[model samples]
Target chain A: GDDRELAILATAENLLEDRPLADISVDDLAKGAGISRPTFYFYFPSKEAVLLTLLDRVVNQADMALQTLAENPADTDRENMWRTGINVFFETFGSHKAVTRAGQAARATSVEVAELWSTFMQKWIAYTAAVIDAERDRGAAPRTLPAHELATALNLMNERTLFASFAGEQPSVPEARVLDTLVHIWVTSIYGEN
Target chain B: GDDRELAILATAENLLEDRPLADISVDDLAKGAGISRPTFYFYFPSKEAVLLTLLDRVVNQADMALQTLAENPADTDRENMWRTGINVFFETFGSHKAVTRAGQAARATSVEVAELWSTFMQKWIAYTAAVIDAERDRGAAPRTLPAHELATALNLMNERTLFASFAGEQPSVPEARVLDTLVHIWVTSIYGEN
Candidate 1:
């Protein structure tokens, strides 16, 4: 409710700049925020709580990239808008690499984070599915598969690919190639051609 | 190296049938295998090692589904083979739901299991890329996207979708719909239409 809570959040963000969430402790967050550990608890119950607040901000920022859809652009602009959506997504997540990656890893262990992430994904999938259905209604895209199912697959593709890229996992796809690859699949999978 | 090692592996597999990797401890594994704690260490360094051995068998059995590709069936049969591949994938993983689910969860915390899983995904991606390339070479499929990039996205879709299904996550896709949806995307993405 006060500056102390904000300080803890800010410290958690700063520590993530150079290290993973697992390496940062409650003590470090407290010291960095100029407060005692007990005081830190007053603001946030645990380190994960601070991380959750940070993740909420990051996810909200990223979700704004899809706002272009509400404008109902012409078919000619649809492809460009979709491509830009992917670009903005990469930019948003890539800028917050450590936080985004930590959130992903935390999902496996932290039930709160996992539930939050899952809720966000379901919302995204539903929104994407609505866009797909709209395209089909306008005859710009073929009804190749159910919109919800296709959207689920495509959304998960983006999530998993981004996770791999952020984590620096193997089969490392080039940054440009990742965008090109996903854009190509999204475009073709829906429109039936590139 | 002997019956004790086999017993340990069997115990780990049986335990997973009823519970998760995190729930089963070294004592559980040792006692289930009819061995003392120290004896369990003698056969396998850790419970994860035993799980690794079990995962090896599951992966190998699942790989057999792709053996159909080596036959080089006519173009008319290519789609059938691909669909069958998806089917076999679901069947194999569905039968070993416990182990497959455990492997997915363990990747976040277990370095050894994560490495093994990464190695397997790379191999699967390369093999899938080769198949995509072959289809393009014979003009049965369009060169819409780079083989490796396209393969990576599609394979990850199968993996992530399966993980969610086995984990009983939300927005659950119906069993039949999962197959039909994936098959449609695969065929249309590569062939340009269903």
Candidate 2:
């Protein structure tokens, strides 16, 4: 019963390893999951549904990091806290390249999926905003844009940067440098001369 | 010759208004464009190709603005120049939501279009980086980033932010506000205290 449902998810992830989300088809996913086309429908309605489930689990994982990162407001020795959040964020995403790409691609078509993506991202933005507000309160961070707006811009920057970075565009770039690059952006954008 | 090509582009744009790039089909487009499916195939080869052509014209049209902005490295009115670049960049993209979104959506499965889009963006990033270098040399722009990577992040942030803002996500946020918000980030990120 649920075996096929799980299979459908696994197959979608596997196929994405070979090709992109847009190149994938429901028919092919049905084949890999070892379910008939009709049976595949019984479990998942469409390829987008498969991606939806995948993304749902991903954001669920991110909620843990968000909780840890957003709640801390000491505005002191919080560098490690922000670092942990960034690391956990990327760790949750790095292994699932195919799934991540599919989720991003799904935005182009499915309204339901795009809304879900925004919901997931808003949590991150708001969490970051909370941190910024706190740091500013302590007079530790730069009094730049409003926390909400600054967080929104920072989140979008990372999203677009990764979409290009991991999509084979900059294969030679090391992951460590990527992490440092983002940390630098967040740190400088926040602490100014730090 | 080109009449059918123009018709096909027109029909795709119209259809995208009602739906999305992923939902549009060559068959429907052929029907709407007064050409058979096979003829549609020969004319553009793919919906993404159609989008590519449309996007190419937009960046080409912005060359005058790019030239005026890139060539005038007075390092004095850098603020106004950056403003002009961001405003012109979005002005080209803002009106053609359907096409820009289609081009972005095509990046999911279309390597050709993604590469083309990156190619276009890299030109902007590199150009912006050169300006940063010039201003830094003249002790005008802040010496924050080395210019290239910083410009890349700024460009990606704007690219991702606009993609979300226009794609039926944040309709209430007017274009002027969005432009100002991004310019603020860019300005502060470079100048720190300024």
Per-candidate TM-score against the hidden true structure: 0.90, 0.78
Writing each residue's lDDT as its tens digit, candidate 2 over A56-126 gives 88778877766765566636465566677777767778777778777887775788877888787877788
Tell me the docking grade of candidate 2: acceptable
Q: Which stretches of candidate 2 lie over 4 Å from their true place?
A: A1-15, A20-48, A71-81, A170-174, A191-194, B1-50, B73-75, B109-111, B141-146, B170-174
**Candidate 1 lDDT, tens digit per residue, B36-114?**
9999888788777788778877887888666654565545576686788788778888888778887777777788888
The DockQ assigned to candidate 1 is 0.51
* lDDT value for model 1: 0.79
Task: Highest lDDT: give the candidate number.
Answer: 1
- What are the clashing pairs of model 2? none
Q: Enumerate the candidates' DockQ scores in order.
A: 0.51, 0.30
Docking class of 1: medium
